[PDB]
Structures are given as structure tokens and as C-alpha cells.
């Protein structure tokens, strides 16, 4: 009971916090991801990320 809620079920363990930043460009508003992690390989390897 103590160690079960602290198990990973989806995502990268090195990733701690990720936020969705937006850009107010007049041409088009685009969305980027600001991740407070230390695993760039996993970030660039995930699906849906350029």
C-alpha cells in the first residue's frame, strides 16, 4: 500500500513535470512542450513530437 501509488504507468520516469506553452503569433498560434526532465532522447523518441 505504501509503494504502489508511487509506480509509473505511463510516461518517462526521468520526466517530472511537463507544461503546454503557447505562442501568440498573429499568423497562427502554435503549441510547444516545456518538460522539466533530463531525458532528451526519450522526449525526441516519443510519438507526436517533432
Amino acid at each position: 500500500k505504501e509503494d504502489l501509488p508511487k509506480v509509473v504507468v505511463q510516461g518517462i520516469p526521468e520526466v517530472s513535470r511537463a507544461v503546454i506553452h503557447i505562442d501568440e503569433q498573429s499568423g497562427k498560434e502554435k503549441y510547444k512542450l516545456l518538460v522539466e526532465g533530463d531525458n532528451l532522447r526519450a522526449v525526441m523518441a516519443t510519438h507526436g513530437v517533432k
Binding site: P5, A18, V19, I20, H21, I22, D23, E24, Q25, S26
Partner: protein, 107 residues
């Protein structure tokens, strides 16, 4: 849930009995069999947030409006005033003029 024995007030654990699992104490032979369901929930905190930010409406939580910037000289502005300088007695300005997404950032 933490349960205690009436005999000595020690902690009760769960142990498999000859006919049914029961609460037992490690010091006294006092036991208590289980008849029906006994549950103990915790209800952890759910991440109800969505983490959306960067909106121009929320970004324009600034004072300076309708000023004259030294770059394009347009009303819109976003000023920051800093006083954390003892070697430089005057204060410090940081202007952010952005309506057509110019991105002006200087001192």
C-alpha cells in the same frame, strides 16, 4: 487502518487462520475473526489541473499601457522595473513592446 488489541493495546496484524483470516496480536493470543468485508480507502489526490498557459489575456497582467517605446513608438507596452542594483544608483527598465509580435526586449 491501524487496529489495536483490547488486551494490551498493541498493533494488530492480519494472519491466516485454520478456518478464516483474522486480526491477531504479536504479544497476546487474542484473535478476532473476519465475518464480512472490511475495507479502508485512502482517496488520493487527483490531478484535476489541465496546465494551460501563455494566453495573451493572462499575459497582459501588466501596468504599462499606451506609452512610447524607444523601438517602434507604439502605445502597447509591457514594462518591468528592477531596483536590485547598489553599484548603479538609478533603477532598471525592461520594456516588452508586443502587439504585432515584434518581441522587443532590451534594457
Amino acid at each position: 487502518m491501524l487496529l489495536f488489541c483490547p488486551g494490551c493495546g498493541n498493533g494488530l496484524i492480519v494472519e491466516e487462520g485454520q478456518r478464516c483470516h483474522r486480526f491477531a496480536c504479536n504479544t497476546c493470543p487474542y484473535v478476532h475473526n473476519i465475518t464480512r468485508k472490511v475495507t479502508n480507502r485512502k482517496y488520493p489526490k487527483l490531478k484535476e489541473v489541465d496546465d494551460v498557459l501563455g494566453g495573451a489575456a493572462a499575459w497582459e497582467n501588466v501596468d504599462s499601457t499606451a506609452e512610447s517605446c524607444p523601438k517602434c513608438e507604439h502605445p502597447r507596452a509591457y514594462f518591468m522595473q528592477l531596483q536590485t542594483r547598489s553599484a548603479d544608483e538609478p533603477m532598471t527598465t525592461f520594456y516588452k513592446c508586443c502587439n504585432a509580435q515584434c518581441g522587443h526586449r532590451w534594457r
